[PDB]
Symmetry: C3
Subunit: 104 residues, 3 copies
């Protein structure tokens, strides 16, 4: 028994309070660059249960639950390489920034 | 310093609202099948601090904090192989379903 | 596409209710010992974005969002080896205890 049961879906909450980042926005981009700038964004893909990938546009939307959603349904998002990640709340206020996901 | 401190205990919350799947139920089963059906379920074990494993019955119960619990105490659950996972709230409504935890 | 976007910062919540362990404390110690006892604690370091590590004193503080904070800012904590971890709420009541993070 090596496979531990847990929750695989990521949840994004505030950094100064216990609240989901409801209607927030996540920008994915080049390692150590501001992903909010369109020129720094990288391709993001939805990985279907099928195993296929459908590239979508940014930013990614975080629903009321703090989970990324596309077309009203929870999705798994993946990129080809490491990336920087900036999370903004519904009011365009920056919640968090991870320069290099791969190093964190 | 390569060991980063984190929270190893999984937490299960609702998919459309920021709440715990309080008193919900988790079914673990064959990859890509409906775990709710007893014919698709696979063994689930509590992994004790001891390293020992004690097989328990399904479904797994989620307490009010959104954590799996057994005998009134937080427990770590493991399976031998990959599995599909379906989460239901206290009212029998499906919260989420991951057909293959390994791929996710 | 193998890099999945997720939330990398750990969040600490209560075990009997869906709340953040606001202003709680985390003790890191020798595997299978009470980390609250200083004799059992191991060194803990903040890993800065820079890649540098600065040792800090224990216990680690959890803010209102249930996130580890130091000097008022969210930090990434790392240690040298596996460890036991005890989490306590603002009232000194124990919330959780993981004897060996490496096994869990």
């Amino acid at each position: 028994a090596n496979v531990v049961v847990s929750n695989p879906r990521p949840i994004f909450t505030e950094s100064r309070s216990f609240k989901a980042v409801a209607n927030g926005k996540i920008y994915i981009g080049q390692i150590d660059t501001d992903p909010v700038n369109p020129a720094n964004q990288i391709p993001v893909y939805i990985e279907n249960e099928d195993g296929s990938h459908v590239q979508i546009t940014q930013p990614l939307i975080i629903n009321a639950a703090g989970k990324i959603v596309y077309n009203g349904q929870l999705v798994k998002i993946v990129t080809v390489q490491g990336h920087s990640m900036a999370i903004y709340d519904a009011n365009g206020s920056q919640v968090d920034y991870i320069a290099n996901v791969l190093k964190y």
